[PDB]
Amino acid sequence: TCTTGAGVTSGFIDLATYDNLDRALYGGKDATTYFIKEHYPVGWFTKLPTM
Amino acid sequence: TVAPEKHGPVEDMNAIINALPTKVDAVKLEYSASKTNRTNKRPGDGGAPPP
């Protein structure tokens, strides 16, 4: 492989690391994920100071 | 007068050989990641549609 090269593949070892504890904590079909933010609408309003 | 019998060393094999599939799972995950297309087949395109 490459030592000094800035490679992203080094994290594939961490990805492959997966045990019973990791299965219990992470994973799952219904498990939510980051990098994806759910968006919901909000009310339409305004504000202004008044004497 | 007899054919000599050859076997393994005095030390047990498993302690040296060991077994940990983290490397092969890392390789498989890297290959699966690289399976998806990562290059661009439309150079000189500008794939932003007009507003």
Coordinates of C-alpha atoms in Angstrom, one line a residue, chain A residues 9-18, chain B residues 21-23 25-27 29-30 33-34:
Chain A
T9 CA -9.3 3.7 2.5
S10 CA -7.7 3.6 6.0
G11 CA -11.1 4.0 7.4
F12 CA -12.3 0.8 5.8
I13 CA -10.7 -1.1 8.6
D14 CA -12.8 0.8 11.1
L15 CA -15.9 0.1 8.9
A16 CA -15.0 -3.7 8.9
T17 CA -14.7 -3.6 12.7
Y18 CA -18.1 -4.9 13.7
Chain B
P21 CA -11.2 -11.6 9.3
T22 CA -11.0 -7.8 9.8
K23 CA -8.6 -7.5 6.8
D25 CA -13.9 -7.6 5.5
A26 CA -12.1 -4.3 4.9
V27 CA -11.0 -5.5 1.5
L29 CA -16.0 -3.2 1.9
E30 CA -13.5 -1.3 -0.1
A33 CA -17.5 1.0 -2.3
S34 CA -15.3 1.1 -5.5

